[PDB]
Curated annotation (Swiss-Prot):
<feature type="repeat" description="LRR 14">
    <location>
        <begin position="361"/>
        <end position="384"/>
    </location>
</feature>
<comment type="similarity">
    <text>Belongs to the protein kinase superfamily. Ser/Thr protein kinase family.</text>
</comment>
<keyword id="KW-0677">Repeat</keyword>
<keyword id="KW-0547">Nucleotide-binding</keyword>
<feature type="repeat" description="LRR 25">
    <location>
        <begin position="698"/>
        <end position="721"/>
    </location>
</feature>
<feature type="glycosylation site" description="N-linked (GlcNAc...) asparagine">
    <location>
        <position position="125"/>
    </location>
</feature>
<feature type="region of interest" description="SERK1 binding">
    <location>
        <begin position="717"/>
        <end position="721"/>
    </location>
</feature>
<feature type="repeat" description="LRR 3">
    <location>
        <begin position="93"/>
        <end position="117"/>
    </location>
</feature>
<keyword id="KW-0967">Endosome</keyword>
<dbReference type="GO" id="GO:0010268">
    <property type="term" value="P:brassinosteroid homeostasis"/>
</dbReference>
<keyword id="KW-0472">Membrane</keyword>
<dbReference type="GO" id="GO:0048366">
    <property type="term" value="P:leaf development"/>
</dbReference>
<feature type="repeat" description="LRR 13">
    <location>
        <begin position="335"/>
        <end position="359"/>
    </location>
</feature>
<dbReference type="GO" id="GO:0004672">
    <property type="term" value="F:protein kinase activity"/>
</dbReference>
<dbReference type="GO" id="GO:0009742">
    <property type="term" value="P:brassinosteroid mediated signaling pathway"/>
</dbReference>
<keyword id="KW-0675">Receptor</keyword>
<feature type="binding site">
    <location>
        <position position="568"/>
    </location>
    <ligand>
        <name>brassinolide</name>
    </ligand>
</feature>
Length: 742
């Protein structure tokens, strides 16, 4: 307790740190109560917080210098790069809280039994470490005094690990968390009569439901993300005080069983296989319910009317079921607190309820996507003094009419998604007033007119998806102002003009898809200034001139990390139909059912059956990438292929077919390691296939037909795997699959 001991113990810790500048104001002839990270009371150290500092030392240093400090009551070393493992040590009787979370502690969890030296320990967070339970489950943690224990996000695989933790007693335990491991077996917390919080989620529990005994204090029960299928209703029947029940992402079946509803605030049965209709007994929860999630089940029927009495409800998730019918406009108006309404992926029908025109003052997310709704979009939505709606998802319905210009009064809008409908008219110029909008998606509609110049006022715009409409005119120069644009998709319209040279100012542009339009002029070399471009599809236009060598300037220097995480669809071209152009169509696909892709048969000549790939967008690099997709087929390009085309290691697809390209194939093609598809067919190419193409080991498809190439086909490589039709109409070429070179 002397200042001598305190300073020497604390400075001895600093003097084992690899980087001592992490504790710069810790100095030996200076009172510790003036140190950053120290907490004092009456000139005595009571707590130390060095969290989020890269200390890079072992637990042995912490136990010898800090945990032994007399009077220390708490030590917070979360995310501090403490490795090693726990061992015996002398612990201050005053220590009540120890936070060693988000570190690299290792060894068996039995190491934690030596923390019993801390006679006063009541709180222990050793989550996000690498502790394990190798071998057989035996003994006990023997930390009876703990009130809060978090062993989550470790490497604990085993059966009945919970029994080991609770073996020596759990009368004082109020909060137990063991999520994110691979624990299995039994969970008996019947003796833990003061347990208020239990989180055994994201484990490998596939047998019995936890035994909660009398359940007299349990307020929070989280068993989600396992493989449970038994009778949870009976196990929780006596739980009178339960406020949160999350049983989602399990293997439960059958109808919604009886539930304890007296105190229930949050309930999630999502991502299971429950069946039936929403039972009316749940009405008994409308006095307390603040959140409900029944998504990802096999529920059906209509939304019951008792939801009108659920006035405290702030989130109603019912998506991905077989719910049907029109929704009650009389029940929604009573949910004054509802801030999330997700009804997506069902078969609700009818017109939008006028209730929404009122709920626009409390809602942040309105998701009705992938339903059977019809009629016009509410022309009076967001008429309230303060409209808080941030996300409007109405895509993949049967909505008709015009896009209401009133939507600009939704000032807080961040995402507008009206794609896959039958909307007509123009893109309202008033949308330029949405100063916070990031996503404007309206593709597969019947929109006409031009792209509003007024989008120049939306500095926050990131995605502009307008494919498969009837838009005309040129690309408005006002988009140069939208400097955060990373995804621009304007395919299958009737647009004209040129690619403006100001495209180079869009530092964040990753995807530029302009196919099947009437764009013309030369390819702007300024495309080479786009530091983020990874997907350029210009197929089926009227572009002319030569391919500028400068496009590939940023090659190697590209680093698009911003686009990652966006739902998409890629419709591969079979090549069996001559009306279908291009390698394939990359299309945004948030909140849309792949089943409705057959709506495209009236706009696209391609066959979609069994050709649809999907996922969330994921670039193959982070910092030193190149262009991944380049399609400029079916234009009128001329000149030679710049040898800088081979500068892109990450290019998967290069489609330059159906042009007037001249010259010879530069040997640099062979440097395109990742090239899965390459065709230069229907062109004016000359010479012989560079022998360096044998470096290409990832080709699944090549087409060099309809050219004037001569000479032998490279003998090594993948060239022999391809049929002769991929080399046909080239009088000078010979060698298997063709006749051997005479
Ligand atoms: C009801 O129950 C469901 C199912 O359990 C919950 O839904 C899941 O919730 C989690 C948590 O939000 C969802 O995603 C999770 O994200 C985490 C990412 O954050 C961590 O990692 C990043 C990156 O390192 C760090 O920046 C950050 O600080 C965190 O450390 C993951 O930790 C989660 O686990 C997954 O990733 C980790 C990576 O360390 C792995 O160890 C895990 O095994 C796992 O792969 C997790 O992904 C998760 O997707 C949701 N699942 C669904 C909806 O199906 C509900 O939230 C819950 N609702 C309640 C209680 O109301
Ligand atoms: C044991 O330690 C772990 C690791 O630190 C810890 O897990 C982390 O908890 C925090 C808080 O519970 C999580 O971060 C929060 O996450 C939610 C949404 O997931 C946000 O609401 C939070 O931000 C709001 O609240 C903050 C106040 O905490 C405000 O500062 C902020 O402005 C927002 O209003 C916040 O981000 C975090 O995701 C986890 N997981 C990690 C870090 O991996 C765990 O809670 C600890 N356990 C115990 C029992 O103490
Ligand atoms: C970085 C983002 C923008 C991306 C959209 C990313 O998310 C996707 O994963 C992206 C990399 C995916 C979407 C479509 C895929 C192609 C689909 C296809 O027809 C395949 C045919 C054959 O099987 C070949 O061997 C491999 C081929 C060419 C595939 C390469 C990888 C692609 C491009
Ligand atoms: C904890 O981290 C430290 C620092 O990285 C590790 O120490 C290094 O260990 C390697 C491998 O044994 C040695 O080659 C280095 O010379 C060590 N350097 C320093 C500065 O420590 C330490 O091994 C880690 N501890 C554990 C248990 O993994
Ligand atoms: C958003 O709502 C306000 C409030 O109703 C509308 O205000 C009108 O603004 C025009 C000029 O733009 C005035 O001539 C009208 O008298 C206003 N009507 C009022 C105040 O009731 C505004 O037009 C709406 N904006 C959009 C794009 O629909
Ligand atoms: C490229 O094309 C430019 C525009 O040509 C005119 O408009 C296009 C859309 C077509 O309709 C075409 O027939 C028209 O003549 C020309 O100005 C330019 O010179 C062309 N460049 C080259 C290298 O041919
Ligand atoms: C989880 O349990 C299953 C059996 O239900 C087993 O096959 C699987 O290997 C286990 N996985 C783990 C512990 O990661
Ligand atoms: C879903 O509900 C609708 C409307 O009641 C019904 O026509 C349809 O067959 C149901 N689908 C399934 C798979 O049960
Ligand atoms: C959608 O609604 C229309 C009436 O507007 C109805 O005829 C049709 O069957 C509905 N489709 C589904 C799948 O419920």
């Amino acid at each position: 307790q002397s200042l001598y001991r305190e300073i020497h113990q604390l400075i001895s810790f600093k003097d084992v740190l690899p980087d001592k500048n992490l504790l710069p104001d810790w100095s030996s002839n200076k009172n510790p109560c003036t140190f950053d990270g120290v907490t004092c009371r009456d000139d005595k150290v009571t707590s130390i917080d060095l969290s989020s500092k890269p200390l890079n030392v072992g637990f042995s240093a912490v136990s010898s210098s800090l945990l032994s400090l007399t009077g220390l009551e708490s030590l917070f070393l979360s995310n501090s790069h403490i490795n090693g493992s726990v061992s015996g040590f002398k612990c201050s009787a005053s220590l009540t809280s120890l936070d060693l979370s988000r570190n690299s502690l290792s060894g068996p969890v039995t190491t934690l039994t030596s923390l019993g030296s801390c006679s006063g320990l009541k709180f222990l967070n050793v989550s996000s470490n690498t502790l394990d339970f190798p071998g057989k489950v035996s003994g006990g943690l023997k930390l009876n005094s703990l009130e809060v224990l978090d062993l989550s996000a470790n490497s604990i695989s085993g059966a009945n690990v919970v029994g080991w933790v609770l073996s020596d007693g759990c009368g004082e335990l109020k909060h137990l968390a063991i999520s994110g491991n691979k624990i299995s077996g039994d969970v008996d917390v019947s003796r833990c009569v003061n347990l208020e919080f239990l989180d055994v989620s994201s484990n490998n529990f596939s047998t019995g439901i936890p035994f909660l005994g009398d359940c007299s204090a349990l307020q929070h029960l989280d068993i989600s993300g396992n493989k449970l299928s038994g009778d949870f209703s009976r196990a929780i029947s006596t739980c009178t005080e339960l406020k949160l029940l999350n049983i989602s992402s399990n293997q439960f079946v059958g109808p919604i069983p009886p539930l304890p509803l007296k105190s229930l605030q949050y309930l999630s049965l999502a991502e299971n296989k429950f069946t039936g209709e929403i039972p009316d007994f749940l009405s008994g929860a409308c006095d307390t319910l603040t959140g409900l999630d029944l998504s990802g089940n096999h529920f059906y029927g209509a939304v019951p009317p008792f939801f009108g009495s659920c006035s405290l409800l702030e989130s109603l998730a019912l998506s991905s079921n077989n719910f049907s019918g029109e929704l009650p406009m009389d029940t929604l108006l009573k949910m004054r607190g509802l801030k999330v309404l997700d009804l997506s992926f069902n078969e609700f029908s009818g017109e939008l309820p006028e209730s929404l025109t009122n709920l626009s003052a409390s809602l942040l997310t309105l998701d009705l996507s992938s339903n059977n709704f019809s009629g016009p979009i509410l022309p009076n939505l967001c008429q309230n003094p303060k409209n808080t709606l941030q996300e409007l998802y109405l895509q993949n319905n049967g909505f008709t009419g015009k896009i209401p210009p009133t939507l600009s009064n939704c000032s807080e809008l961040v995402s507008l998604h009206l794609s896959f409908n039958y909307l007509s008219g123009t893109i309202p110029s008033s949308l330029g007033s949405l100063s916070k909008l990031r996503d404007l998606k309206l593709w597969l509609n019947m929109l006409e007119g031009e792209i509003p110049q007024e989008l120049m006022y939306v500095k926050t715009l990131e995605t502009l998806i307008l494919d498969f409409n009837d838009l005309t005119g040129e690309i408005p120069s006002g988009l140069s102002n939208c400097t955060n644009l990373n995804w621009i998709s304007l395919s299958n319209n009737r647009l004209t003009g040129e690619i403006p040279k100001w495209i180079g100012r869009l530092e964040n542009l990753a995807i530029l898809k302009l196919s099947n339009n009437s764009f013309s002029g030369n390819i702007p070399a300024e495309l080479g200034d786009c530091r983020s471009l990874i997907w350029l599809d210009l197929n089926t236009n009227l572009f002319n001139g030569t391919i500028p060598a400068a496009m590939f300037k940023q090659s190697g220097k590209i680093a698009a990390n911003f686009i990652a995480g966006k739902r998409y669809v890629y419709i591969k071209n079979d090549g069996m139909k001559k009306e279908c152009h291009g390698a394939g169509n990359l299309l945004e696909f948030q909140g849309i059912r792949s089943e409705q892709l057959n709506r495209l048969s009236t706009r696209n000549p391609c066959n979609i059956t069994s050709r649809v790939y999907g996922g969330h967008t994921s670039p193959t690099f982070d910092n030193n990438g190149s262009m991944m997709f380049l399609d400029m087929s079916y234009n009128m390009l001329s000149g030679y292929i710049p040898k800088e085309i081979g500068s892109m290691p990450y290019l998967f697809i290069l489609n330059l077919g159906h042009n007037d390209i001249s010259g010879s194939i530069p040997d640099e093609v062979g440097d395109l390691r990742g090239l899965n598809i390459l065709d230069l067919s229907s062109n004016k190419l000359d010479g012989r296939i560079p022998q360096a193409m044998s470096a290409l080991t990832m080709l699944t498809e090549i087409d060099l037909s309809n050219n004037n190439l001569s000479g032998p086909i490279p003998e090594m490589g993948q060239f022999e795997t391809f049929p002769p039709a991929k080399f046909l109409n080239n009088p000078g070429l010979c060698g298997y699959p063709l006749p051997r070179c005479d």
